[PDB]
Every structure is written in C-alpha cells, then in structure tokens.
Design a protein around this nucleic acid. Structure first.
Lengths: 133, 136
DNA sequence: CCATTCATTCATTCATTCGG
DNA sequence: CCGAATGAATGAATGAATGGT
C-alpha cells in the first residue's frame, strides 16, 4: 500500500464509471487512443488497467495516456492447459518460483506438456506477482 | 450434486416465492438492485438465477448480491436477432454429440452444410458449450 | 410477464516481440 | 538471454431481441 497505489485505484475506478457513462467499451477506448498516443491498445490491456492487473510502472504510464484522453473524450492457435496441470504447476510454483532448466523438463514430462509451454507458464506466473493487485 | 449446489437450489426457491409475494417482477428485481449493488441487472439474468441457469461460481456471486437485496427489500416494501432454422439446430445438436469443440475447419464445413455464416456457427458452439456448464 | 435464443462485452489464459 | 510491455485466442458473464414450447 502506498499513496500512489491509492491514487491509482481511485483513477481506475473513476475511469470505469466515466467510460461507461460516455458509452465506450474497453475495445473502443483502446482504439480511440491513437489520437493521444499515436498507436492503439487492446481490450485486454484496458481490462488489465481497470482491474490493475499490470505492473506499477506500466500503470503510471497508461494512467497518463488515459487521463489525457478521458478529458478529450468529453463531448456534447492457443493450447489450453488441463485443470489438473494448473493446480500442480501452481503447487510447484509455491515451492520454487524460479525452477531450473532441468526441473522444467522433468515436470513437463510428468504433465505430458511441451518444454516451452511449461517454461512460459512460470514466466507469466512470475510476472503475475508483479501486479498492482 | 455437491453439498454446495443443494443450498443453491434452496435459495432460488425461497428467492422466487419472496420475490413474487412482494409483488416484484423479474424485470423489477433487476432494476431494484442498483440501490444495494450500484448497477442493475436484467430479467434474463434474474430468470437464469431462479432456474439455476448459470455457472456454479456465477450462481454463488449472484446469490450473495440477491440475498443482500432480499434483506433490504423485505424490511421495507411489499439491432435484430436472426433465428436459426429448426432443422439446422437439430443438425448442430447432432454434430455436437460427435465433437463439442469443433475445429476452425469443421465450423466452415457445417456453416456450408447448414447454410449459415461461419461466425453464427462458432458462437452457437460457444453458447452450447456454456449450456453444459450451467448448474441446471 | 417468464423462458429461451442469438449476440456482445468483459475477464483470463497462453503466447510473442524487443528493448537493456 | 532475461523480463518488461501487449495482444490474439479463449473462457466467462450478461443483455437485447424474439417467442411463447
């Protein structure tokens, strides 16, 4: 907890209500940002901001981009991992956040998954713990 | 089913009687929730709850919101859709038994076989899959 | 007025690019 | 090669439209 996170929550909550009152969807705000940013975002990225599911540094950046736009908008292929593997992987994650290159292959065989998918899983799992909750 | 689902049925029955005895319609309950929730629901959403046509997690969520409303409401108060042909739906349900999650290619094979757009068939299987995840 | 369907939005995973 | 910044593809929740089954 910190005065910056509190001001971050307040803005994310205020951005959500004013976005809905203005009739914008998460996909629309992500699209209508090239005017203030020079490139558009995605409904995924916006959802992460409103729910603060991104890093603190990324949040301060996007809050700056989004605050300038909000004012300006005031007018008049994938492979899904089994449920049994996820609780096991999350269980392995509790005992070793950073597993070795050999531990990854040893578990990839225990779960019948490719080496990369288990490797990237722990990567994304680690980044998940770097969020603003 | 599980002991938690049993308590879920029980509440829906008690919610339905207390909702009707208080003279609330499904559309009215959805609107009269902004006072205790901050945003309203829809007659569709309420109907799904009474019939337990939602996911187990979703039912527990709504049961929490609606129970808080019942307490607060029992202490002061008293575009266009395109319909898919019947022959195609029976065909899709026939296709669904031999493959719940069809590939991107089977969807085009069925869209042509049933004279439907590819997206319409994609969303059908999506909604069909969710239908097997609801509690009732 | 309730039930059911088609259609869309919001949330989450798995995945890829690209600076230090 | 590591991790930070981002999204397409997927699963999840919720509505408007339509049909009364």
């Amino acid at each position: 907890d910190s005065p910056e996170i509190r001001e971050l929550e307040k803005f994310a909550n205020e951005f959500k209500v004013r976005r809905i009152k203005l009739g914008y969807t998460q996909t629309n705000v992500g699209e209508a940002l090239a005017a203030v940013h020079g490139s558009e975002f995605s409904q995924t990225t916006i959802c992460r901001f409103e729910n603060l599911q991104l890093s603190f540094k990324n949040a301060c950046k996007l809050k700056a981009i989004l605050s300038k736009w909000l004012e300006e908008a005031e007018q008049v292929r994938r492979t899904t991992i089994s449920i049994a593997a996820k609780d096991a992987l999350e269980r392995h994650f509790g005992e070793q956040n950073k597993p070795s290159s050999q531990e990854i292959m040893r578990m990839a065989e225990e779960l019948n998954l490719e080496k990369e998918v288990v490797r990237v899983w722990f990567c994304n799992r680690r980044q998940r713990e770097k969020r603003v909750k």
